[PDB]
Design a protein around this ligand. Structure first.
Ligand SMILES: CN1CCN(c2ccc(-c3cnc4ccccc4c3)cc2NC(=O)c2c[nH]c(=O)cc2C(F)(F)F)CC1
Ligand SMILES: [Cl-]
Length: 304
């Protein structure tokens, strides 16, 4: 009925705000990105520092893993994405085309494509092998905060400060759906559920919503956290009980019961805004990352 996440490790090494944490799909690693221009890799289960990957000329907003856990893509204020071979540390490609800061990135499940979102208000779809931009979608009328492929990679969901969530046909680039409820505050985060049936979206009015995107309807609302300024990443936790996990501008990690919308746990320990959370793919493990006054990542574990 409630999880019991408790602090296991604190991962220190970044010298500026940590922007994003992601578990590799094989569960072995955690990748982090930071305003210090670095990506760091850490052991998912022991928190042990593994390696630093360098190359971007300015801060990094996001990182994401290929399905086989061998590659990473990073999104940077230097207006590029980079594709990295994690084992070698090599920069395989630099993806150039956005006209301003790149805020978000994801591989498709096949991992032959990358999707990015930018301050330039576009969503771009890239070929992984060539590094070429395949499509530029004039997706929004304000900065794009998140981009995510669905389960089979046929759809992309995007969120923007224009107050909309939009769903795109990956093959054609056509907009298939615009989601909007009874108001349009900036949408700061969106992703598909693991089964691809729902979309979780955050807005800068301290709210998370669960949407049925086939039906175009909001099913659940989660509140009690603080989120009016930063684009804070949230997740579905599915390995034990079914939770919603998010960071918060009061420095806590919030966990909600997905069905009942009740807050079930608030994880204390960070000293600044928790801007990113991630949920381990097979174990009940959460990673959280915090901003400039904290500079650390924390790994929490629960029995359920
Ligand atoms: C995993 N998340 C991290 C936050 N993302 C993001 C999203 C949006 C913006 C942003 C930034 N500026 C904006 C100005 C006007 C209107 C909208 C704006 C939106 C800016 C960001 N990125 C940052 O806040 C950021 C950028 N560059 C960094 O070096 C470090 C960070 C961060 F604060 F650590 F996360 C998305 C991915
Ligand atoms: Cl190193």
């Amino acid at each position: 009925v409630k999880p019991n996440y408790a602090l296991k490790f604190t991962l220190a090494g970044h010298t500026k705000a940590v922007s994003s944490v992601k578990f590799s799909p094989n569960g072995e690693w955690l990748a982090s990105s930071s305003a210090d221009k670095l990506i760091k890799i850490w052991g998912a289960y022991d928190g042990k520092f593994e390696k630093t990957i360098s190359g971007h000329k300015l801060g990094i907003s996001d990182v994401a893993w290929s399905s086989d856990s061998n590659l990473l893509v990073s999104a940077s204020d230097d207006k590029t994405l980079k594709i990295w071979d994690v084992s070698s540390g090599k920069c395989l490609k630099t993806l150039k085309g956005h006209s301003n800061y790149v805020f978000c990135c994801n591989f498709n499940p096949q991992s032959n494509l990358i999707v990015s979102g930018s301050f330039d208000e576009s969503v771009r779809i890239w070929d992984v092998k060539t590094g070429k931009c395949l499509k530029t979608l004039p997706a929004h009328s304000d900065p794009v905060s998140a981009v995510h492929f669905n389960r089979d990679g046929s759809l992309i969901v995007s969120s923007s400060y224009d107050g909309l969530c939009r769903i795109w046909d990956t093959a054609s680039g056509q907009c298939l759906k615009t989601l909007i409820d009874d108001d349009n505050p900036p949408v700061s985060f969106v992703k598909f559920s693991p089964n691809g049936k729902y979309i979780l979206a955050a807005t800068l009015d301290n709210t998370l919503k669960l949407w049925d995107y086939s039906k175009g309807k909001c099913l659940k609302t989660y509140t009690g956290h603080k989120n009016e300024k930063y684009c804070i990443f949230a997740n579905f936790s599915v390995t034990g009980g079914k939770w919603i996990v998010s960071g918060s501008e009061d420095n806590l990690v919030y966990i909600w019961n997905l069905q009942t919308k009740e807050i079930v746990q608030k994880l204390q320990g960070h000293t600044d805004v928790v801007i990113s959370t991630a949920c381990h793919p097979t174990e009940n493990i959460i990673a959280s990352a915090a901003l400039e006054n904290d500079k650390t990542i924390k790994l929490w574990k629960s029995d359920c």
